[PDB]
Amino acid sequence: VIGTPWQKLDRPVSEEAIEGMDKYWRVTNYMSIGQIYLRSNPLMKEPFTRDDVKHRLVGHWGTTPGLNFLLAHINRLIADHQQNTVFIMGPGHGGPAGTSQSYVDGTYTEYYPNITKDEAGLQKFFRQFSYPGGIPSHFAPETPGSIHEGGELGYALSHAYGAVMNNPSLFVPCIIGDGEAETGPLATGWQSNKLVNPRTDGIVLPILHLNGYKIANPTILARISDEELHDFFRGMGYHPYEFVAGFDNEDHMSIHRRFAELFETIFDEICDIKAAAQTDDMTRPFYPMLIFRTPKGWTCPKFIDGKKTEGSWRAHQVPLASARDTEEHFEVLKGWMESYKPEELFNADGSIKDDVTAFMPKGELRIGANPNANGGVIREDLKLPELDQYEVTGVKEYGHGWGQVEAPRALGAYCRDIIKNNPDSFRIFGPDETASNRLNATYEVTDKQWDNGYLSGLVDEHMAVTGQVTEQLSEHQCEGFLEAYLLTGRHGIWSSYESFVHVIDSMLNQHAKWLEATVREIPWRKPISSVNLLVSSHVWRQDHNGFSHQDPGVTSLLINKTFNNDHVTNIYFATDANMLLAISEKCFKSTNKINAIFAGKQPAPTWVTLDEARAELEAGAAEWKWASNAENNDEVQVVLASAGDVPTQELMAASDALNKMGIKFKVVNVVDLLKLQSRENNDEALTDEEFTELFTADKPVLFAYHSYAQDVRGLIYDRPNHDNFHVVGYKEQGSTTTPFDMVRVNDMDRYALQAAALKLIDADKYADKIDELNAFRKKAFQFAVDNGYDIPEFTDWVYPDV
């Protein structure tokens, strides 16, 4: 347990602390300007000239001084209260404020020993910001203190809230851009306070950085009336406080006193809410939130070239773009840097004076050092139940292809027991789909956590104010919550109807990018758990729905994250429940990954034993020898290959029929897609020799793909025998229809697959059989049209093992 959580001060903030906070604000303002403008001479020692100014001025001043003000006050708070604290920088383009924070708290020099606490260190600190060979413009994962970069705006609040889940001692002041608040994901973010519990979760404090402006526009929230703004936050279940500063001549020390006193009122209320929640954990409190209304660019020159800058969108990027080039602009920069009076903040050796930091928290309470902001230092392996107890045993008992098992129900029972063994560190998220995707065996040991109105046990099944499943009809919220949950060292999984995974494609992009930078160059940031996503209710079996719900293409997005042997992405196609089991265990042991686990939820055949799934998963693709009828690759007329539960069922029925015709083939199943890539693009892929062995050197390959055929084609482009692959995939065809018709209109049904294989073997010899199969598909459809359900030859076919 870190510090002394939820303690009130019961005295005023000291005058020493106010003094220190103004010194912090002035030094972090100064060094943020230095990071942006200065290539050398950080203390402006004589001669200080244009030659000290960066050739390329890049970065973001506007948000930065308001961030630095808040961080002064949050730091002061942490230290007075000994409060376990992680902040979120929504305006992540304010990167100098987060690097300045770490540098002041001492963690920057601890993590980066070359960036020393003295003039030479400070020169390097200024130069290196947004610079070739240096550091990023944003609150990147290489910044001690960051679990959120804030490059792609809108995830401030889901991360803040996922971080405090099952973290009752943790306090998260979440700085949100007022421009950011215009995004979709941020707007639904506010509603998370109905989904956390004030006894078992920690506390988020939304701080709205209402600086009036985004890039080139005012913001919506800053320009509505104050009464609308207050009604807004009250209507979302918060107690709003508003702070206004910086628009008149109020002196800075007065501003600090007033803000500290306000911030103490807000914290006191948080402490009262925490204390009350130990007794009453059912009443949802009105959590405080802070509206912080200060000028953009605060403390910068009011006008530059006769244009309003402080208190404007003009302050957004880099004021004085000509500081290197004119001398008019350099004089303004010099005066600006001087107004912070650095001669009072730095010792002659260029170290930051002791009296600038005496007020700062220390040790692991420092914002840069809290282990919650590097959660893999506190992550523990899950206590996993043995997989074998979950196996579908039907394959051993009756044969390959047996039964009508709904595959995710095995993952559900497994997840149930993981929750039981790890009761406060493994969460399930679902956009109102947990049950729909068949993971509700989990409710046998816990509830959907819901901290909002209850009506009746006749309607309110499987929910309680505390629990380890969270649902909200928002994919951004599910993915945001989980990411931060993982980033602070815990574990879990979510699920989503496959076509709607795309809502959060850009979230997968950013978390994959966080993972990339991390495995490449941040060894101090320890491994976190993986994002585990069950992609179910797939393209082929969206029976109550239709075309809008048919889009397996998150595959294609994920493929754009597969470089440089990072290995931060995996795409798995579970063939049935036993494959699902094998994949899930690997996923739950893995770290530093996004894992997409595709499985169908419909009743379906089970193809492999558990032991077989384990061996196959390990290699990535496997021959199914019990299904091949050819002896060796020379005897093979076609390779029958599959990835996907329905492509597989269809390929298998086709193989049954090709067998009965005396065609000689082999069956290859593919589970781990990226392992089809060449070793040169992927050092963990099948070797060429392994690839050739599976797929032959010179025989045609019929490949039935779950998603767009383009994926497999681009992936195998430098593989031997690639020109022989015929890839059949989803091709934007379907509607509200029978299971047979869905595969039919994509040429994915068994008859079409058979026909395709014939065409590849000898189109002339089998012209007639092909026609006959093409017509049988037409007859099977008409039969569905006329009767309301699929032709029994189709529905009732079970694989000949049995």
Ligand X SMILES: Cc1ncc(C[n+]2csc(CCOP(=O)(O)OP(=O)(O)O)c2C)c(N)n1
Residues making up the annotated binding site for Mg(2+) are: 178, 211, 213
Query: Which 560-579 residues touch its own copies, going by CB under 8 A?
Result: 560-561, 563-564, 566
CB-neighbour burial class of residue 199 (10 A; exposed 0-12, middle 13-18, buried 19+): middle
Which one of its own copies, Mg ion, ligand X, none is in contact with 710 (Cβ closer than 5 to 8 A by kind)? Answer: its own copies
Longest Cα pair distance anywhere in the chain, in angstroms?
95
Nearer of residues 549 and 593 to ligand X, judged by Cβ: 549
Binding residues are: 63, 93, 151, 153, 178-180, 211, 213, 296, 316, 500
Minimal CA–CA distance to 735: which of 544, 523, 588? Answer: 544
The 3-class secondary structure across 457-470, one letter per residue, is CCCCCCEECCCCEE
Q: Which is nearer to Mg ion, 181 or 196 (CB)?
A: 181
Question: Among residues 615 and 775, whose Cβ is nearest to its own copies?
Answer: 775
Which member of 732, 762, 771, 772 binds its own copies (CB under 8 A)? Answer: 732
Interface map 186-205 toward its own copies (x if CB under 8 A): xxx-xx--x-----------
How many residues contact its own copies, by CB under 8 A?
Answer: 138
Alpha-carbon distance 146 to 136, whole Å?
Answer: 13
> By CB under 5 A, how many residues form the interface with Mg ion?
4
Min dist CB 229 to Mg ion, Å, is 14
* Burial bucket for residue 238 (CB in 10 Å: 0-12, 13-18, 19+): buried
Among 75, 468, 474, 649, the residue binding its own copies under the rule CB under 8 A is 474
Query: Residues annotated in the binding site for thiamine diphosphate, as ranges?
Result: 63, 93, 151, 153, 179-180, 211, 296, 316, 500
Nearer to Mg ion, 5 or 62 (CB): 62
- As measured in angstroms, the least distance from the Cβ of 777 to Mg ion is 39
Helix (H, G, I), strand (E, B) or coil at 606: strand
What is the nearest approach in angstroms of Mg ion to the Cβ of residue 700? 51
Side by side, the strands of the sheet bearing 569-573 are: 463-464, 448-449, 469-471, 426-430, 491-497, 531-536, 594-598, 569-573
Scan residues 141-180 and list those touching Mg ion (CB under 5 A). Answer: 177-179
Query: Both tokens of residue 472?
Result: 């909200």
Interaction residues for its own copies, span 734-773 (CB under 8 A): 735-738, 741
The answer to whether the bond into 96 is cis (omega within 30° of 0) is no
- Cβ distance to ligand X smaller for residue 296 or 593: 296
Among 247, 283, 353, 454, binds its own copies (CB under 8 A): 454
Rounded CA separation 147/514 (Å): 9
Residue nearer to its own copies on the CB measure, 227 or 397: 227
Instruction: Select from 557, 587, 622, 630 the one that contacts its own copies (CB under 8 A).
Output: 557
Pick the binder of its own copies from 516, 576, 645, 749 (CB under 8 A). 516
Stretch that binds its own copies, among 78-86, 373-381, 655-663, 705-713 (CB under 8 A): 705-713
Length in residues, the chain: 802
Q: Which of 264, 433, 612, 749 binds its own copies (CB under 8 A)?
A: 433
Taking CB atoms within 8 Å and a gap of at least 24, the contacts of 757-764 are 757/638, 757/640, 757/654, 757/658, 757/663, 757/665, 757/700, 757/702, 758/663, 760/638, 760/700, 760/702, 760/726, 761/637, 761/638, 761/663, 761/700
- Considering Cα of 41, then 43, then 48, then 52, what sign does the dihedral take? positive
Contact (CB, 8 A) for 570 and 596: yes
Of 455, 523, 680, 764, the residue at the interface with its own copies (CB under 8 A) is 455
Per-residue contact string for residues 210-249; x = within reach of Mg ion by CB under 5 A: -x--------------------------------------
Cα–Cα dist 783/791, whole Å: 6
Contact positions with its own copies (CB under 8 A) in 602-661 = none
Give the one entry of Mg ion, its own copies, ligand X, none that residue 778 binds, where binding means its C-beta sits below a cut-off of 5 to 8 angstroms depending on kind. Answer: none
Whole-number Å distance between alpha carbons of 198 and 6: 12
Cβ-based nearer residue to Mg ion, 213 or 794: 213
- Residues 6+ positions from 758 with CB-CB distance below 8 Å: 663, 766, 769, 770, 773
Residue 137 Cβ, how far from its own copies at the closest point, in Å? Answer: 4
Helix (H, G, I), strand (E, B) or coil at 603: strand
Which residues, 393 to 432, sit near its own copies by CB under 8 A? 432
- For ligand X, the binding residues (CB under 6 A) are 62-63, 91, 93, 152-154, 177-180, 183, 209, 211, 213-215, 219, 296, 316, 431-432, 473, 497, 500, 503
How many helices (H) and strands (E) are present in the chain, helices listed first?
26, 22
Would you count residue 495 as binding its own copies (CB under 8 A)? no
Toward ligand X, which CB reaches closer, 338 or 432? 432
State how far the Cα of 174 lies from the Cα of 191, in Å rounded to an integer.
14
Q: Is 471 among the residues that bind Mg ion (CB under 5 A)?
A: no
What span, in angstroms and rounded, lies between the C-alpha atoms of 117 and 95? 19
CA pair distance 531, 496, nearest whole angstrom: 13
Minimum CB separation of residue 219 from ligand X in Å reads 6
CA distance 508 to 505: 5
Neighbour-count burial for 274-294, b at 16+ CB within 10 Å, e otherwise: beebeeebeebbebbbbbbbb
The distance of closest approach from Cβ of residue 45 to ligand X in the complex, given in angstroms and rounded to an integer, is 32
* Contacting residues for 237 by C-beta, under 8 A, at least 6 apart: 191, 193, 194, 284, 286, 287
Q: Is the Cα torsion angle 642, 643, 647, 653 positive or negative in sign?
A: positive
* Residue 371 binding its own copies, by CB under 8 A: no
223 touches, from its own copies, ligand X, Mg ion, none (C-beta below 5 to 8 Å by class) = its own copies
Select 295 or 492, whichever has its Cβ closest to ligand X. 295
Site pattern 54..93 for its own copies (x: CB under 8 A): xxx-xxx-------------------------------xx
Pairing of strands 621-623, 665-670: antiparallel
Residue nearest to ligand X (CB): 177
Region near its own copies per CB under 8 A, out of 118-126, 398-406, 501-509, 591-599: 501-509
Q: Give the count of beta carbons closer than 10 Å to the beta carbon of residue 69.
A: 27
**What amino acid is encoded at 117 in this protein?**
K
Helix, strand, or coil (residue 198): coil
**Exposure of 192 in the CB half-sphere (CA atoms within 13 A):** 35
In a 10 Å sphere around its CB, with 0-12 CB exposed, 13-18 middle and 19+ buried, how is residue 11 labelled? Answer: exposed
To its own copies, the closest distance from the beta carbon of 148 in angstroms equals 11
Residue 544 interacting partner from its own copies, Mg ion, ligand X, none (CB closer than 5 to 8 Å by kind):
its own copies
Selected binder of its own copies within 244, 441, 547, 679 (CB under 8 A):
547
**Nearest distance from C-beta of residue 307 to its own copies, angstroms:** 8
Residue with Cβ nearer ligand X (91 or 189) = 91
State which residue, 170 or 507, has the beta carbon closest to ligand X: 507
Element (H, E) at 702: strand 701-705
Residue 301: CB minimum distance to ligand X, A: 18
Q: How far is the CB of 730 from ligand X (least distance, A)?
A: 19
Which among its own copies, Mg ion, ligand X, none contacts residue 62 (Cβ within 5 to 8 A by kind)? ligand X
From residue 174, alpha-carbon distances to 63, 90, 226, 375, 588 in Å are 14, 7, 21, 18, 29
Binding to its own copies (CB under 8 A) within 106-145 occurs at: 130-138, 140
In angstroms, give the least distance from the CB of 319 to its own copies.
Answer: 13
Shortest reach from residue 346's CB to ligand X, in Å: 27
- Beta strands, E only, 501-565: 531-536
Site for Mg ion, rule CB under 5 A: 177-179, 211
